[PDB]
Design a binder for this molecule. Structure first.
Ligand code: MG
Lengths: 172, 70, 29
RNA sequence: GUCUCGAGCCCUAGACAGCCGGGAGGUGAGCUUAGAAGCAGCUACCCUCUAAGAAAAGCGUAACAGCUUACCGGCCGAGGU
């Protein structure tokens, strides 16, 4: 099979070996696309994902490579934005971005601050009760967003009564 | 402004309550000219253009109650 | 060729004298 | 999990899926009931408008409301089940 992806005018992408770098106005994303007998190349204005084999496993990955490249195109132009809201019942939760990590203080009454590190060139902007995770790499942004929700994970007590935490509101 | 269809059948029949099983148990009765009076009343309520199809909507409550037509 | 699609074309061709695919098919007639 | 072979059916008069739009009136059917208006129960389950739209398939409400299913139309475009 062979699937040709036309590159947008805002975007220009180079390639070396198995790595594909995609540059644009919102940033640059480099990804490694490696799978048996699947050749990913740049043919001037199009990105070609081809293979000599047409089996279920090869087809699965050709379609995964397509979505990864189309996502990189969107990332370097419009970008990726995940919106989050911080909910608290009794204890006022202090969410702040201290350095290259987002810190959550006084969660459920804890003295010790809960913290997670931000993945790559992802930016976390906070406007009071709303947080917006943004950046070019969907892998980095999607994780940094998820990491924030996962940071307030509660296994010991009932999640239905103890609903405090930062949750994902908008998915792109 | 115009009252419901279910009440307009009970006025020109003489009966108040319906039945336990419709069509199988006949209670009330209407004629040919008695359905032509109820067709003149409802105009913005019904979506029918002609006066012929306006009568069919009134009969669509009658035979499923216990009303026989003569 | 389904029988209802043929009967619908014959209903649209009738109203031109007196789906967007069934309208285009009727216009070509 | 993956490979191979057969059968039926659907499809460029646009299939399968997804997304958008519509999902309307007589009437909130009748009986029951303080009330029950698709949706507690019983019975019926009828016809207008129309390109569709059940006397309502599933949640939801004290009852409404609200969310969608049927069904119809659009976007899409190649196989689908
Ligand atoms: Mg316990």
């Amino acid at each position: 099979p062979r699937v040709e992806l036309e590159i947008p005018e805002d975007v220009d992408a180079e390639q070396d070996h198995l790595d594909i770098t995609v540059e644009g106005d919102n940033g640059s994303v480099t990804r490694r696309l490696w799978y048996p007998d699947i050749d990913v190349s740049v043919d001037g204005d199009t990105v070609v994902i081809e293979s000599d084999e047409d089996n279920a496993k090869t087809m699965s990955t050709i379609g995964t490579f397509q979505s990864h490249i189309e996502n990189m195109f969107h990332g370097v132009t419009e970008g990726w934005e995940y919106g989050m809201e911080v909910f608290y019942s009794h204890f006022p939760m202090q969410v702040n971005v201290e350095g290259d990590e987002v810190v959550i203080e006084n969660f459920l009454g804890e003295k010790a601050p809960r913290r997670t590190t931000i993945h790559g060139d992802t930016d976390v902007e906070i406007d009071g009760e709303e947080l917006t995770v943004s950046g070019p790499d969907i892998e980095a942004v999607g994780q940094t967003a998820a990491d924030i929700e996962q940071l307030t994970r509660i296994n010991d007590k009932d999640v239905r009564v103890f609903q405090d935490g930062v949750y994902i509101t908008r998915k792109p | 402004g115009v009252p419901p269809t279910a009440e307009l059948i009970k006025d020109e029949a003489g009966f108040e309550t319906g039945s336990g099983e419709p069509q199988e148990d006949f209670v009330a009765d209407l004629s040919v000219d008695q359905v032509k009076q109820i067709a003149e009343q409802k105009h913005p309520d019904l979506l029918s253009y002609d006066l012929t199809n306006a009568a069919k909507e009134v009969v669509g409550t009658c035979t499923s109650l216990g009303v026989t037509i003569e | 060729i389904p029988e209802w699609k043929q009967e619908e074309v014959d209903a649209i061709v009738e109203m031109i004298e007196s789906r967007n695919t069934l309208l285009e098919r009727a216009l070509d007639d």
